[PDB]
Design a protein that fits this description.
Belongs to the protein kinase superfamily. Tyr protein kinase family. SYK/ZAP-70 subfamily. This is Tyrosine-protein kinase SYK. It is found in: Cell membrane; Cytoplasm, Cytosol. GO terms for molecular function: ATP binding; integrin binding; interleukin-15 receptor binding; kinase activity; non-membrane spanning protein tyrosine kinase activity; phosphatase binding; phospholipase binding; phosphotyrosine residue binding. There is one protein chain. This protein has about 260 residues and is α+β, with helices and mostly antiparallel strands. It folds into two domains: about 1-80, Phosphorylase Kinase, domain 1; about 80-260, Orthogonal Bundle (Transferase(Phosphotransferase), domain 1). It is about 35% helix and about 20% strand. The chain contains eight helices and twelve strands. It has a five-stranded antiparallel sheet with strand order 1-2-3-5-4. Strands 6-8-9 form a three-stranded antiparallel sheet. A two-stranded antiparallel sheet has the order 7-10. α3 (about 95-115) packs antiparallel against α5 (about 180-195), α3 (about 95-115) packs antiparallel against α8 and α7 runs antiparallel to α8 (about 245-260). The chain is globular and about 55 Å long. The relative contact order is 0.12. The structure holds ligand X3G. The site of the ligand Cc1cn(-c2nc(Nc3cc(C)c(OS(C)(=O)=O)c(C)c3)ncc2F)cc1CN1CC[C@@H](O)C1 has 16 residues, from β3 and β6.
Length: about 260
């Protein structure tokens, strides 16, 4: 899995510091995005690569390899159009049917992840990357964890720098991360998509979002969001873990609705 540094060329300017690059492979170059590291975070990057190395699915960013040089580097295949949230921000003309296509692709990628017993733990519109306007891939496995064969959740030790606004109550309250908690994040991700990349819980601190959810409150329907997609978000935001759907159920619902609407 070890790549040759002389064969890698990075553009100066950064697109957690990611740069564009070109890496000569065989007879041709391949365009790449490289995660570059800046003395225990070494292991974290290699853990991330170890996860990516075990995943093979159309809707997941493929790792090319690792490069020990200079800084430690994680080389990935380039998705030109970039993050979903910023793309939809700058392309308000994108049609709901196209957003359904995209979020459904994310659900297939997440279904695969659930079947593989990996938890992403950072599912958000910022970590969905567009290869084309009709092709999305899940990125950023820096927080991901492989589940044990005998357990359906990962238990964190303490509360680090966490994207609180994408996290289910059980994550915040018990540090328990399952595929079901990824479903909650997927709900927030859907909200983001149909709001054309608006931030969720705008202006609210994490503590206030947690209190809002604890009162049985949820985010509103985005302007022009298909009712069936809003209803799916609310299902993703089921408080009780056991009654919240897994990704198979979520993917099925999205697929049937996508196929029926196109
Ligand atoms: C780990 C990682 C992989 N990638 C990857 N990123 C791309 N394409 C791409 C393309 C562009 C034009 C970008 O910049 S941007 C803000 O859209 O102007 C960015 C940030 C990424 N391809 C493959 C990857 F593997 C990005 C990241 C960093 N993530 C953290 C913030 C999230 O937006 C993306």
């Amino acid at each position: 899995v070890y790549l040759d540094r002389k064969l890698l060329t990075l553009e100066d300017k950064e697109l957690g510091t990611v740069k564009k690059g070109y890496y000569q492979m065989k007879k041709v170059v391949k365009t790449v995005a490289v995660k570059i590291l800046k003395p225990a975070l070494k292991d974290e990057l290699l853990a991330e690569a170890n996860v990516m190395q075990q995943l093979d699915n159309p809707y997941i960013v493929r790792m090319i390899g690792i490069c020990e040089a200079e800084s430690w580097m994680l080389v990935m295949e380039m998705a030109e159009l970039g993050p979903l949230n910023k793309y939809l921000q700058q392309n308000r003309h994108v049609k709901d049917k196209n957003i359904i296509e995209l979020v459904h692709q994310v659900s297939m990628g997440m279904k695969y992840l659930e079947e593989s017993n990996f938890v992403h733990r950072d599912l958000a519109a910022r970590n969905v990357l567009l290869v084309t306007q009709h092709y999305a891939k899940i990125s950023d496995f820096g927080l991901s964890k492989a589940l044990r064969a005998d357990e359906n959740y990962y238990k964190a030790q303490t509360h680090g720098k966490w994207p609180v606004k994408w996290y289910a109550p059980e994550c915040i309250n018990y540090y328990k991360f399952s595929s079901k908690s990824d479903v909650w994040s997927f709900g927030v991700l859907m909200w983001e998509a149909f709001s054309y990349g608006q931030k969720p819980y705008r202006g609210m601190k994490g503590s206030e979002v947690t209190a809002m959810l604890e009162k049985g409150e949820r985010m509103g329907c985005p302007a022009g969001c298909p009712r069936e997609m809003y209803d799916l978000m609310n299902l993703c935001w089921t408080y009780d873990v056991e009654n919240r759907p897994g990704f198979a159920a979520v993917e099925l619902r999205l697929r049937n609705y996508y196929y029926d609407v196109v």
